[PDB]
Design a protein around this ligand. Sequence first.
Ligand SMILES: OC[C@H]1O[C@@H](O[C@H]2[C@H](O)[C@@H](O)[C@H](O[C@H]3[C@H](O)[C@@H](O)[C@H](O)O[C@@H]3CO)O[C@@H]2CO)[C@H](O)[C@@H](O)[C@@H]1O
Ligand SMILES: OC[C@H]1O[C@@H](O[C@H]2[C@H](O)[C@@H](O)[C@H](O)O[C@@H]2CO)[C@H](O)[C@@H](O)[C@@H]1O
Ligand SMILES: [Cl-]
Ligand SMILES: [Cl-]
Ligand SMILES: [Cu+2]
Length: 235
Amino acid sequence: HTLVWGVWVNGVDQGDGRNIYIRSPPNNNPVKNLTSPDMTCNVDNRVVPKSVPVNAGDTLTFEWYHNTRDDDIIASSHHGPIAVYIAPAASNGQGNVWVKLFEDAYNVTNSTWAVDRLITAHGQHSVVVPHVAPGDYLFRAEIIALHEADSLYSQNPIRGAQFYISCAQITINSSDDSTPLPAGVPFPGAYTDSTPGIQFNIYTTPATSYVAPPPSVWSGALGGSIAQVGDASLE
Ligand SMILES: OC[C@H]1O[C@@H](O[C@H]2[C@H](O)[C@@H](O)[C@H](O[C@H]3[C@H](O)[C@@H](O)[C@H](O)O[C@@H]3CO)O[C@@H]2CO)[C@H](O)[C@@H](O)[C@@H]1O
Ligand SMILES: OC[C@H]1O[C@@H](O[C@H]2[C@H](O)[C@@H](O)[C@H](O)O[C@@H]2CO)[C@H](O)[C@@H](O)[C@@H]1O
Ligand SMILES: [Cl-]
Ligand SMILES: [Cl-]
Ligand SMILES: [Cu+2]
């Protein structure tokens, strides 16, 4: 159970974005039905009044929290990967539009899941804004908690992979468009019961064998991190 509080741009806090520039759901419960319309941008996908201005090459940091800002972030049980996707905003996240900018699943070097590192990072993970066409975008940050993913939700709706999905409205102002955004995948639709990384038993299957759900990270993506970029406690 986790939500996005807001974003930072080049280490500058853009302030509380909930229901303002984040398409916030009413609560931190997960989405679990892979064919749900809720897979796009969680259960309350609608235009919110603001979009955060960025330029190509800016560091864009998502900040998650559990109950209050800069708390436990997400229950430690919720091991799993983190991904960020981008789609043009006029799509409203519909159709073949979502392009993956970031993936971090299990780090063999550190012996930690992305979620484990997200907690240590006070809920902060970042991407480099890509060199796409100037305009309005949705950045879809997705945490998959795998602690009940040994079952398919479609088998047993009390369990399944858990999707914590948050869509931020971002406006890309200055961009040379050196990497035009291609068509991408649909949500719902990209993940199915047979997709690698959706059904996974973390109790019996080593995390060294985990394969995150496709799609692969786009060739235009410039990278990211899971690391504290801003200190919320200084405000
Ligand atoms: O035993 C089932 C699994 O429970 C996980 O804890 C979650 C609880 O089941 C869930 O009810 C609770 O939901 C809270 C939420 O955390 C809180 O922010 C909100 O204000 O109220 C909700 C309703 O009470 O969330 C926790 C996760 O934080 C365990 O983490 C898991 O190990 C266990 O298998
Ligand atoms: O960040 C580690 C993460 O990498 C995943 O592979 C990506 C990589 O992140 C990205 O830089 C490159 O552009 O594409 C590949 C393929 O999608 C990998 O799938 C994860 O297991 C790993 O934790
Ligand atoms: Cl939970
Ligand atoms: Cl959310
Ligand atoms: Cu939870």
